[PDB]
Amino acid sequence: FLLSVVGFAVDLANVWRFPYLCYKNGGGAFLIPYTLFLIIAGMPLFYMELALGQYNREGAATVWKICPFFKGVGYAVILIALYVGFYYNVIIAWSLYYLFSSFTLNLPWTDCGHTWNSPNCTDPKSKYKFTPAAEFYERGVLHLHESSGIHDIGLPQWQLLLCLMVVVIVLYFSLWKGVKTSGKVVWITATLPYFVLFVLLVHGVTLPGASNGINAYLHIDFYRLKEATVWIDAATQIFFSLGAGFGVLIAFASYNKFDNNCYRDALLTSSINCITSFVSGFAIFSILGYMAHEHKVNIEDVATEGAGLVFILYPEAISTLSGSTFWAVVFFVMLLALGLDSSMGGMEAVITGLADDFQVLKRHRKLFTFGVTFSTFLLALFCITKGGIYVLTLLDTFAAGTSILFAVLMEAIGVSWFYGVDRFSNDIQQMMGFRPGLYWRLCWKFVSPAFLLFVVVVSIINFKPLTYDDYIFPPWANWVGWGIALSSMVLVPIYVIYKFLSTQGSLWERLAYGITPENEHHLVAQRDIRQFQLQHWLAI
Numbered sequence: 001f002l003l004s005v006v007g008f009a010v011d012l013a014n015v016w017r018f019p020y021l022c023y024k025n026g027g028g029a030f031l032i033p034y035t036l037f038l039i040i041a042g043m044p045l046f047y048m049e050l051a052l053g054q055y056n057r058e059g060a061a062t063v064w065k066i067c068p069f070f071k072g073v074g075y076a077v078i079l080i081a082l083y084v085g086f087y088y089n090v091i092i093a094w095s096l097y098y099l100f101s102s103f104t105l106n107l108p109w110t111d112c113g114h115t116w117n118s119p120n121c122t123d124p125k126s127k128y129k130f131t132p133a134a135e136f137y138e139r140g141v142l143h144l145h146e147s148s149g150i151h152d153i154g155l156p157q158w159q160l161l162l163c164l165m166v167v168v169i170v171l172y173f174s175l176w177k178g179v180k181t182s183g184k185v186v187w188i189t190a191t192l193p194y195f196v197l198f199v200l201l202v203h204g205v206t207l208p209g210a211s212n213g214i215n216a217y218l219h220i221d222f223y224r225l226k227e228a229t230v231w232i233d234a235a236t237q238i239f240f241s242l243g244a245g246f247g248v249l250i251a252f253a254s255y256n257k258f259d260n261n262c263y264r265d266a267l268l269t270s271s272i273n274c275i276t277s278f279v280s281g282f283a284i285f286s287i288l289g290y291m292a293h294e295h296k297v298n299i300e301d302v303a304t305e306g307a308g309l310v311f312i313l314y315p316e317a318i319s320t321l322s323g324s325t326f327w328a329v330v331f332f333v334m335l336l337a338l339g340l341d342s343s344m345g346g347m348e349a350v351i352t353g354l355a356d357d358f359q360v361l362k363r364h365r366k367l368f369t370f371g372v373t374f375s376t377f378l379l380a381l382f383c384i385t386k387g388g389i390y391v392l393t394l395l396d397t398f399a400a401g402t403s404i405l406f407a408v409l410m411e412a413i414g415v416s417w418f419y420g421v422d423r424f425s426n427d428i429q430q431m432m433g434f435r436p437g438l439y440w441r442l443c444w445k446f447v448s449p450a451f452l453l454f455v456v457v458v459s460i461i462n463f464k465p466l467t468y469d470d471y472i473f474p475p476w477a478n479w480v481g482w483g484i485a486l487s488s489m490v491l492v493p494i495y496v497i498y499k500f501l502s503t504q505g506s507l508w509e510r511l512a513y514g515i516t517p518e519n520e521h522h523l524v525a526q527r528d529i530r531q532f533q534l535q536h537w538l539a540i
């Protein structure tokens with residue numbers, strides 16, 4: 001089964017979202033708070049999720065039959081997936097346009113004489129926005145020059161609408177009949193991305209002036225580590241790239257067997273994730289160093305720090321290889337495959353999580369997938385407009401920020417403190433052949449929550465306004481973003497209150513029906529609750 005651990009560790013979050021986060025934070029100084037969070041609270045909250053899903057064969061919302069008070073955490077990890085699906089599909093819509101626009105002998109992003117070119121373009125033969133490759137993305141693809149801000153936003157663009165419809169149709173017809181959407185599409189996302197990355201890495205070392213871009217990647221500065229921004233960016237990116245906190249792992253583990261080894265599958269994914277991220281950063285910074293001996297400017301003053309860094313970088317590196325059309329086609333085919341697989345995984349996670357709860361949607365899958373996909377298309381229509389990059393930035397900043405860390409922290413607290421690390425270890429020993437040990441028990445009970453809470457608190461206290469590289473957002477945009485962020489975090493206490501007023505009895509007999517497994521129904525009456533003695537809470 002050593003193909004899924006290779007075909008799933010890389011997705012559209014290590015080749016798109018990691019480059020610009022590494023570039024913005026400096027490069028190198030971003031890998032110190034990345035490995036720490038991967039070792040401390042990235043592997044344990046992958047092993048725990050896999051074990052929970054494999055033992056309790058339920059989705060991401062009804063798995064909380066071991067502690068009914070915490071069922072709101074299951075509902076709080078579906079809205080985040082919905083938002084991520086919206087802007088994920090919007091972003092995938094660009095790769096189709098770039099692939100279709102590359103079936104020529106002279107690529108559009110190499111010349112400075114096309115219709116969409118302003119009378120300020122400069123051909124070398126904050127950010128410089130007049131370069132031929134960065135002007136294409138801004139004008140002939142996004143049409144950003146017709147929007148004055150987030151308060152203007154024109155009508156949707158008719159050229160990306162067709163690509164969005166194509167992506168929506170592909171997703172629907174992929175997830176319309178069966179859950180097995182992984183046994184025939186893992187032979188393109190497991191081999192091609194590695195080949196393309198290797199070619200790019202082996203080419204980006206002979207470029208003139210490419211040593212100055214790798215002498216800054218392997219150079220640690222100690223003044224960016226005293227500010228609480230990289231510590232939050234790395235913490236969010238770890239959970240974005242690993243899959244924890246979205247409910248995907250539980251849903252995809254509930255369909256496996258009862259003798260699978262989660263230990264090996266958890267230790268064989270983080271290593272590949274780290275290696276892929278390091279290699280991607282190396283290649284990206286090599287290309288950035290190359291694009292400084294041409295414009296004769298500094299490394300920090302080239303390119304953007306937004307979502308278009310890869311679309312500005314990679315087309316400017318394909319043009320140097322011999323046979324540019326072939327490599328462009330291969331690269332964008334790989335991007336399309338990665339995006340489609342990730343979107344399919346997320347949508348399947350949402351659908352399974354919602355269908356395991358209500359049994360009426362389990363018999364109607366074609367009428368439910370259509371509804372989910374149509375809602376996603378309608379709510380993703382916003383980012384296709386003229387000023388859609390502003391909405392994309394707002395969603396990227398606020399959809400999964402503090403909310404995902406809060407959800408993961410609540411998951412860890414509910415699984416450990418209120419259930420029992422002893423009970424979890426006994427279940428794992430019943431399923432597999434061994435016991436979790438001591439490192440994982442000490443990590444999942446004391447160390448991981450102590451870091452997640454610190455990150456959440458320091459992110460709440462140290463909040464900075466929202467900008468896009470030249471544009472300070474209006475003040476009400478921050479209010480809207482915080483409302484979006486709180487829309488997921490507010491679901492945890494609401495379910496607690498509802499379940500407290502829903503049951504019948506006294507306070508002692510109402511608090512005792514939400515801290516015990518649902519199958520131990522005839523134990524509360526005989527006053528047999530193990531959570532009322534210190535021996536349960538004194539077990540490390």
Ligand SMILES: O=C1Cc2cc(CCN3CCN(c4nsc5ccccc45)CC3)c(Cl)cc2N1
Nearest residue numbers: 008009081084085088242243246252342343346
């Ligand atoms: O068994 C298994 C299954 C499995 C899947 C994965 C991929 C993790 N990725 C998936 C996409 N991600 C989304 N979260 S929400 C959302 C909404 C729309 C589109 C994408 C998304 C981010 C995390 C990994 Cl790395 C290991 C394993 N192991």
